[PDB]
Amino acid sequence: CYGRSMATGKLVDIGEAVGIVAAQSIGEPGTQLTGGLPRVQELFEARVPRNKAPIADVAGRVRLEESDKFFKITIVPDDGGEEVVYDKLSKRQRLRVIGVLSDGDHVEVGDQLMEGAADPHEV
Amino acid sequence: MLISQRPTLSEETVAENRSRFVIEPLEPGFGYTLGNSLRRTLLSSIPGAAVTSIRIDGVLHEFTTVPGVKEDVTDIILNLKGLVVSSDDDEPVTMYLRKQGPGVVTAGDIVPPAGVTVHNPDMHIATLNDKGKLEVELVVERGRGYVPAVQNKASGAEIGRIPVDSIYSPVLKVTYKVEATRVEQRTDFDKLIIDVETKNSISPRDALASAGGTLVELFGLARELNADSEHIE
Amino acid sequence: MLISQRPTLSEETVAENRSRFVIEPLEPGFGYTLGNSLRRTLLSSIPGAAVTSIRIDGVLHEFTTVPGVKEDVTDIILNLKGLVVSSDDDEPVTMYLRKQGPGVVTAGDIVPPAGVTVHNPDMHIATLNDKGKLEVELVVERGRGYVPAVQNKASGAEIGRIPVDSIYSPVLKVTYKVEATQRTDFDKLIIDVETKNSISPRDALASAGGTLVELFGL
Amino acid sequence: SAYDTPLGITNPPIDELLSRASSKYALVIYAAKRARQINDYYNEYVGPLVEPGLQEKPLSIALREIHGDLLEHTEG
Amino acid sequence: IVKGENIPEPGIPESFKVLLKELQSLCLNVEVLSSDGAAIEMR
Amino acid sequence: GRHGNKGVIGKILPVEDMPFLPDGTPVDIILNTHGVPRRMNIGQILETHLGWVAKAGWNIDVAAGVPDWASKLPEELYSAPADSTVATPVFDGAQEGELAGLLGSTLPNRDGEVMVDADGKSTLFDGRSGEPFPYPVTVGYMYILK
Amino acid sequence: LTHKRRLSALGPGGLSRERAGLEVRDVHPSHYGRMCPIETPEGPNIGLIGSLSVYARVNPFGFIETPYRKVENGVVTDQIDYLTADEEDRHVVAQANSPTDENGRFTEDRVMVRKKGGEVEFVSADQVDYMDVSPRQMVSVATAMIPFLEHDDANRALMGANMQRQAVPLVRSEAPLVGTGMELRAAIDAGDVVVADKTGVIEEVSADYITVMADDGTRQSYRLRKFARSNHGTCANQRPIVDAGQRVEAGQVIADGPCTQNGEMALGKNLLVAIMPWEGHNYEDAIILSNR
Amino acid sequence: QCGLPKLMALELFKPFVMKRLVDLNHAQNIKSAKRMVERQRPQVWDVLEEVIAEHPVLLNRAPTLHRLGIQAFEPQLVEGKAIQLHPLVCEAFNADFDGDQMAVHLPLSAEAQAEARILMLSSNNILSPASGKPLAMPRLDMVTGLYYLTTLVEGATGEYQAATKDAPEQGVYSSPAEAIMAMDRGALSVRAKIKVRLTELRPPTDLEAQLFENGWKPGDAWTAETTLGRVMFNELLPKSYPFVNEQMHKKVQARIINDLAERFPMIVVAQTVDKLKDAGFYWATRSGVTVSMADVLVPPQKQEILERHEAEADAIERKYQRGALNHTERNESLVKIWQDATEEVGKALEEFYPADNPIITIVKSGATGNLTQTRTLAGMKGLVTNPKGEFIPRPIKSSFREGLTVLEYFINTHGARKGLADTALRTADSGYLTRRLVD
Amino acid sequence: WLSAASFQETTRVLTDAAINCRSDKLNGLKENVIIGKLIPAGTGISRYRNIQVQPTEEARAAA
Numbered sequence A: 001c002y003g004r005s006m007a008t009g010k011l012v013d014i015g016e017a018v019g020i021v022a023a024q025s026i027g028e029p030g031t032q033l034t035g036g037l038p039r040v041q042e043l044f045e046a047r048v049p050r051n052k053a054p055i056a057d058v059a060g061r062v063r064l065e066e067s068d069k070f071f072k073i074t075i076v077p078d079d080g081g082e083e084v085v086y087d088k089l090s091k092r093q094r095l096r097v098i099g100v101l102s103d104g105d106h107v108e109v110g111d112q113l114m115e116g117a118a119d120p121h122e123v
Numbered sequence B: 001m002l003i004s005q006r007p008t009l010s011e012e013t014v015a016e017n018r019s020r021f022v023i024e025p026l027e028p029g030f031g032y033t034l035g036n037s038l039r040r041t042l043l044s045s046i047p048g049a050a051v052t053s054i055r056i057d058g059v060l061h062e063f064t065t066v067p068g069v070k071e072d073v074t075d076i077i078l079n080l081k082g083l084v085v086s087s088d089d090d091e092p093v094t095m096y097l098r099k100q101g102p103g104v105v106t107a108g109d110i111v112p113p114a115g116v117t118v119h120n121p122d123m124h125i126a127t128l129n130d131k132g133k134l135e136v137e138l139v140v141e142r143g144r145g146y147v148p149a150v151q152n153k154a155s156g157a158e159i160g161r162i163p164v165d166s167i168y169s170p171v172l173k174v175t176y177k178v179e180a181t182r183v184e185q186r187t188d189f190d191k192l193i194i195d196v197e198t199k200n201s202i203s204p205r206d207a208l209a210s211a212g213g214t215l216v217e218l219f220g221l222a223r224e225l226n227a228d229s230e231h232i233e
Numbered sequence C: 001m002l003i004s005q006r007p008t009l010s011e012e013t014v015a016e017n018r019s020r021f022v023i024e025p026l027e028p029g030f031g032y033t034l035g036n037s038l039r040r041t042l043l044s045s046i047p048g049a050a051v052t053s054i055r056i057d058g059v060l061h062e063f064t065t066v067p068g069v070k071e072d073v074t075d076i077i078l079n080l081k082g083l084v085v086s087s088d089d090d091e092p093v094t095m096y097l098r099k100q101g102p103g104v105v106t107a108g109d110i111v112p113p114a115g116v117t118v119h120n121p122d123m124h125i126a127t128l129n130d131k132g133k134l135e136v137e138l139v140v141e142r143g144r145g146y147v148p149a150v151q152n153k154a155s156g157a158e159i160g161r162i163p164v165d166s167i168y169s170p171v172l173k174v175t176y177k178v179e180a181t182q183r184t185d186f187d188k189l190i191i192d193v194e195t196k197n198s199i200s201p202r203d204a205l206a207s208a209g210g211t212l213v214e215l216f217g218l
Numbered sequence D: 001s002a003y004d005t006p007l008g009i010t011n012p013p014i015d016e017l018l019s020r021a022s023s024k025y026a027l028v029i030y031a032a033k034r035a036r037q038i039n040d041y042y043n044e045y046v047g048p049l050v051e052p053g054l055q056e057k058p059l060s061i062a063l064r065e066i067h068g069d070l071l072e073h074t075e076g
Numbered sequence E: 001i002v003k004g005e006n007i008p009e010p011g012i013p014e015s016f017k018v019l020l021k022e023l024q025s026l027c028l029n030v031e032v033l034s035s036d037g038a039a040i041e042m043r
Numbered sequence F: 001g002r003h004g005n006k007g008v009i010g011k012i013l014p015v016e017d018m019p020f021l022p023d024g025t026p027v028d029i030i031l032n033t034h035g036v037p038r039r040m041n042i043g044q045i046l047e048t049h050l051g052w053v054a055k056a057g058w059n060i061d062v063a064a065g066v067p068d069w070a071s072k073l074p075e076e077l078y079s080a081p082a083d084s085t086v087a088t089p090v091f092d093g094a095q096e097g098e099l100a101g102l103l104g105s106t107l108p109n110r111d112g113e114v115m116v117d118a119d120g121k122s123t124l125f126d127g128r129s130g131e132p133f134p135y136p137v138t139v140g141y142m143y144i145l146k
Numbered sequence G: 001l002t003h004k005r006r007l008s009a010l011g012p013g014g015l016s017r018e019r020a021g022l023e024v025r026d027v028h029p030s031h032y033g034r035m036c037p038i039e040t041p042e043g044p045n046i047g048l049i050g051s052l053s054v055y056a057r058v059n060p061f062g063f064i065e066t067p068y069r070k071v072e073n074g075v076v077t078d079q080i081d082y083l084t085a086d087e088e089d090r091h092v093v094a095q096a097n098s099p100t101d102e103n104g105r106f107t108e109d110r111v112m113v114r115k116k117g118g119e120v121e122f123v124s125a126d127q128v129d130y131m132d133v134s135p136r137q138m139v140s141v142a143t144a145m146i147p148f149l150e151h152d153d154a155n156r157a158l159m160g161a162n163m164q165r166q167a168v169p170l171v172r173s174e175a176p177l178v179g180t181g182m183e184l185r186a187a188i189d190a191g192d193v194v195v196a197d198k199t200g201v202i203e204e205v206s207a208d209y210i211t212v213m214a215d216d217g218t219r220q221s222y223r224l225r226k227f228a229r230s231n232h233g234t235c236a237n238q239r240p241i242v243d244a245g246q247r248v249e250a251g252q253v254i255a256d257g258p259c260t261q262n263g264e265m266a267l268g269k270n271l272l273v274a275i276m277p278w279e280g281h282n283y284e285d286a287i288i289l290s291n292r
Numbered sequence H: 001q002c003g004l005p006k007l008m009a010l011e012l013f014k015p016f017v018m019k020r021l022v023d024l025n026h027a028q029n030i031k032s033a034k035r036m037v038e039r040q041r042p043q044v045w046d047v048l049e050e051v052i053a054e055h056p057v058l059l060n061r062a063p064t065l066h067r068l069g070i071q072a073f074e075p076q077l078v079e080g081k082a083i084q085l086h087p088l089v090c091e092a093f094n095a096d097f098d099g100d101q102m103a104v105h106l107p108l109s110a111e112a113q114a115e116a117r118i119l120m121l122s123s124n125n126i127l128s129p130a131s132g133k134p135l136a137m138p139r140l141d142m143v144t145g146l147y148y149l150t151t152l153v154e155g156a157t158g159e160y161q162a163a164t165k166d167a168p169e170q171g172v173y174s175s176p177a178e179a180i181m182a183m184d185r186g187a188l189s190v191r192a193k194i195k196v197r198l199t200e201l202r203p204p205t206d207l208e209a210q211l212f213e214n215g216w217k218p219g220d221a222w223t224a225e226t227t228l229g230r231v232m233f234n235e236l237l238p239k240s241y242p243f244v245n246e247q248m249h250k251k252v253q254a255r256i257i258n259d260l261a262e263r264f265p266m267i268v269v270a271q272t273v274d275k276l277k278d279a280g281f282y283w284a285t286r287s288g289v290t291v292s293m294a295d296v297l298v299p300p301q302k303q304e305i306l307e308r309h310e311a312e313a314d315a316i317e318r319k320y321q322r323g324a325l326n327h328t329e330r331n332e333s334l335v336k337i338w339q340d341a342t343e344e345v346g347k348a349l350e351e352f353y354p355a356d357n358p359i360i361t362i363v364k365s366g367a368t369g370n371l372t373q374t375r376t377l378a379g380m381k382g383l384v385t386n387p388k389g390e391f392i393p394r395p396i397k398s399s400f401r402e403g404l405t406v407l408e409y410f411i412n413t414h415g416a417r418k419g420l421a422d423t424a425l426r427t428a429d430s431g432y433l434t435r436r437l438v439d
Numbered sequence I: 001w002l003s004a005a006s007f008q009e010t011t012r013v014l015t016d017a018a019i020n021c022r023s024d025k026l027n028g029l030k031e032n033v034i035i036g037k038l039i040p041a042g043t044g045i046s047r048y049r050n051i052q053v054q055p056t057e058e059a060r061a062a063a
């Protein structure tokens, strides 16, 4: 399951402690990380993202609406079941890209609705 | 004045052609000082006979080719550059190689004039296609070092005259390195490793002593000035 | 195409301390390897002619001053480094220097024993005033190269002796150059040898060759 | 294979040693115990199954022994 | 090393013995148990 | 040096085998070329050139007139003897134009030959093999602290 | 000399090294001519420690002032007025080097100026009030000692200043072949050099002491520090640069200090340098030396 | 191997030698042995070399980031008080010779020495155990040394022609040993285009099938066209390896050494790289790479380009001076005007530099440096950031070649310091992350 | 529990451990480091450290 040892170039040996090696392989370049160590730390610590971005709750076409200062996204499920609404999306975050999401685009169960960092707990 | 202890000269034999030589210990920094002069004395200074110019029958204004042989003009010249024969003439002598019919020519088919002796008969020269003949003249003059092909005057009047790069000296490759001894009786002393690949004319030991003498007497020009100051033996 | 006109080494003169030397002819691609082979040996193995230790009555070590002398003992040792001496040797021999009253001390004021000489008496050692008195003996040994001061804990010396770094190098500055001999080109190199006046460029190049000749063997 | 000639610690080559044991870790205990075994003899008791070098260190010996397949081992 | 014998097997680090003592001084009862026989004494 | 360039002494060679100028004058320090370009300390190369200027002296540039570069302008600086010391206050120092003009100047070692060109380079001879180094190398005098 | 003149934000009555953020470490526009921006520690003291600038001067109330030359109607006077940071935000500071005209006045059509932003601007000679006393007002003493400073990135310059104060006195103490202004005045103001306070002539010169007979009829003598051990173990040895007969003037330099030669700071030696890479010996910042 | 200061070695091994010189009768009892080592009587040195032989030691440099920060070597007694570190392990240790120090540790028990020789030995750890890429691979000097070796120069000395009419080809050599005799004389250039017969090297794949295909060239002779250096380069690779015949960038060197690890034992790669080192240095010095105010070139188009955007700036600034322009837009516009010009000067600069210049060769070969770096040296350093983190619309028009100005310099440090402060807290946080990953 | 204590929030950890009356099996490698045991990884794993070595009877013959 682990696969080849990057050092030997062959199947990993049975003694190898790959956790420590993973820890070091990840942290060593951290000095070169200038969207950086804060984002990395954000991921490994599983905190809710800096600017939360919503993910599709279900599959269906998307109805886009622009309020004043906000965005409204509604997913009409292919069920077709209960419509699913995403209430106030600050226009500062814009939207994710396929190009940029537009009214009528289809969406699968996991897709990211807006540029940002999806809450890992939510996914 | 000077006494020091102690240098010695030993040799590891890699092949009948090749030998490695090492001198231990030197006094720092004498490795760099002499070693580069030795690579030169063996390479450029040793008397030996080599081919100078050649002309083939049937090649005059043609660029490269020889009907009846798979080897072309260029391939045969460098094929011939490897010919090793010690000549006693001191003046250019023309040997002759003439052969016909299907067959493979070798350095044994060439008839040396009296005083020139070919040291590598098995040497391959050309492959003769079915029903073919080859005629070649070879100019062999003594010399030293490596003298690139000379067009002087230049090749000039002679039509079909091909000057060739002449490897005059027996030793075709040499290199040196420097390492340090010792166990701290002598700490960081220099050890010189010299790598000599030789042609069958002379052995490595012969080419070393030849360099030794040509270099020793060479420096006699300076020692004759006084002889007062000296060193250890 | 053997060209044998045996190498010719002819001397020259430029100044009294240095003289050019020329050797012709030589096979192509030589003078460099042959020139540097002499320069390397000249800048190192020419024997001397150097001062090992020194003793000054008043001072027990290098780091004090002397009454009335302008230079501290360490800045005086530095000056005495520039001494260019020469000795028939063998075995160590002590020189002597004593000067009183104002003036300026120089190498001329050094009284050498029988069999040694000081070749730049013009050299400034220390400047003394009415109270200044300098009594110092110097030990000249013979050798070659650069030998760092031998500490008297390693030697058998007592607390008084000041060991000093010793430079035995008759030769001062050395260079060379070559000029080929067009086809048929040979090589002729000229070497420029300068000495400190402890020996002539002739005698040193003789030393180098003599030292360089004995080394090549087979 | 021509790798030229290994000097000192690099002889014998790991690769030729790793064919004599399951992993690099096994190779360590393999040679390691044999070395403690040799040193005892100079005062288990057996070996130097190979011809000792002049001053050769027991660990260096045990590695040569392993290279020549002069000993077998059983993993735990 | 001075007798050229084999290097012996290691013992317990003194710092660890100290840690147990420092935890005891906090009213933390720290026992080192074997597979059994239960409590081992550091001494 | 004063520019932030630092390093340990990795080796010290017999004065016999060192890059040495045509005079037979050995160089004291050999600094690696690679550390220089990426560190933005290039001032250390300037003072390496000026260092050679100040050590060897120089002349104008006159007559007939004063050249275009000196016009902005070195004053009484037209000539300095060998070994004279220079001062380039930080934010008004010597300027690139003025360096080149000075870089050619002045012989001799002793003999009338010149040891450095208008590029601040010279042909060094390897004191090891005795043969020259194939390309012209930058030489000069740098101020380095212990 | 830089240890005095150091100003640090740590200590009792000030913030701790750990708590203070990078806003205090950044250089402010008002540091100009007061606190040298190019000089601070590389460690995690960066920006908390700095050295007072060359012409900077402290106010009786504790605010740093910088010298300026006031300009009126496109003409820079000889009036030199020391202004605090508050009164500098009040006016327009002309650039130190702007072309000078005959008896002096604005030559260049327009003037380089600093605003109260501080935000730089280009306006004609019309609106200026004060001008800079000279370049390197912003620079500190050690910084002002880097030849060709303007060509080196602030990163390597900082390292360069720090390492000058890291050098050690040599026995010989040779002065820099290519220098800057400060070497002269930084050595005398350091106090490690022997200066004469009255014009006169030298009665005696010994390694131990130097006496001068003033024109005043008074007699001054100076005992020389000899092989004195310094705080960190360097050598404070001094040497006389004068001879018995010599005439001398007030404020002149009688004897050299540990790092000085003939009155100017000598922190090192002038060496013949070759910038070629050499046989993998000087590599990765390593250096090779002549056994000389 | 590693250079170990003999004084340091003596103390490290003290109990070992104390035994040895009691075994040999140098000292009668252990007490005498101890004094013999302390006073450093000359007999001990020969003894030290005995005990230290094939007895490994661990070398560490702090901070230790990956396990490669500790490696075992074979100690060699060295004069002086410094430590001689192989130049190919700098990468792993991140070792600067600016005065870094390193710790030495002496493994004692048989198991510890085994772990050193087998697990941690220098030559068995080559590839990074993260990306698998090679680490000990040549770098810096060794790049430019080989890059120069393998490069091909149009119209160099001895260039094969090939001859026509009255002359044969003229660019051909009996053997590689001949092209050397030609190179030592002024005839041949190492970077020349000549073709040669090679008995002892191995041709490529395609040219292998067409020439032999029986078949192979174990002792056989064959001819290809390459630079003399490219020949000597391939003499460094294993005899079994095919003939590459390229000029070696760093990446090209990475390709090959990556390939040696897949197809060959480690010992082979260990020795191959050792040979790349020796060659790369010899030719890095013969490379003729230096730096000079002269070798720093500036594009002449910089002036016009500079004043070209000066108008666009003062005009867009003229549009803001008119009052219509949005202040944030005018400043923002100055960013785009100047940011763009910085590329043109980069484009213009790159276009100016002859390909053999020493400054560009360093960056081209991948040894060290950037173009962004060589853009600030000559041309323009470009826009810089205020401490607030924004972009100061005032560009630095000068480059560090012409020198910056009082205000140009004061502005640069504004940002340049904030970066050097970051580098401080980037190791403090990165290490705090690594400690959590590890746990 | 001693692995957690050495990591962070030592006081919080020790207090919860003493109340839960926690027993640490000393399986992990950090625990074995603290007490000086052989970490259960690499050469310290059972299969490797229990290796038994003897020369082949064929080898002993050649002596």
Ligand SMILES: [Mg+2]
Binding pocket: H096, H098, H099, H100
């Ligand atoms: Mg460092």
